[PDB]
Amino acid sequence: EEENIYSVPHDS
Amino acid sequence: TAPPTNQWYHGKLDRTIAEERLRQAGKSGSYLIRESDRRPGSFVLSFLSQMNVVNHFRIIAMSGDYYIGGRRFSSLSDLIGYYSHVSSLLKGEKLLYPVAPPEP
């Protein structure tokens, strides 16, 4: 199954 | 300063239920922390944005510390404190409302 996408904080 | 763990930690929880729990809260700035079901032993900060979009940020636990992006925190309390009071998590948005599990 395709993994979900994760975000990175605005400061990184 | 940050709310106690019982107020925002959900244990191992998949993304679908995490988003449902945040949309039941329904307020921008709502957040929770969960263990990822897909990458067990690593954690996720799930956050309901001003645009009714849940954002998910990995938190990697290493040596009793927590890493999000390239930033190191010694506790999840310190991490939540930082993105509640010190730095924006998204442009113009900080952590506001901890969401507790319906079961502790």
Residue numbers in the entry:
A (entry chain U): 1100 to 1111
B (entry chain A): 174 to 277
What do the study's own words say?
Binding of p190RhoGAP is mediated by phosphotyrosine-SH2 domain interactions, and a major driver is thought to be between the N-terminal SH2 of p120RasGAP and pTyr-1105 of p190RhoGAP. p190RhoGAP recruitment has multiple effects, including inhibition of Rho signaling by locating p190RhoGAP to the plasma membrane, and activation of Ras signaling by suppression of p120RasGAP’s RasGAP activity when it is bound to p190RhoGAP. Therefore, in this study we determine the crystal structures of the N-terminal SH2 domain of p120RasGAP alone, and its complex with a phosphorylated peptide corresponding to residues around and including pTyr-1105 of p190RhoGAP. The SH2 fold consists of a central β-sheet flanked by two α-helices, and both crystal structures reveal that the p120RasGAP N-terminal SH2 domain adopts this fold.
We next obtained co-crystals of the N-terminal SH2 domain of p120RasGAP in complex with a synthesized peptide, EEENI(p-Tyr)SVPHDST, corresponding to residues 1100 to 1112 of p190RhoGAP. The co-crystals diffracted to 1.6 Å resolution and contain one dimer per asymmetric unit. Good electron density is observed for all residues of the peptide except Thr-1112. Interestingly, a three-residue cation-π stack is also observed between the phenyl-ring of pTyr-1105, Arg-231 and Arg-212. In the co-crystal structure, the βE-βF loop is stabilized by peptide binding which allows a hydrogen-bond to form between the carbonyl oxygen of Leu-262 and the backbone nitrogen of His-1109.
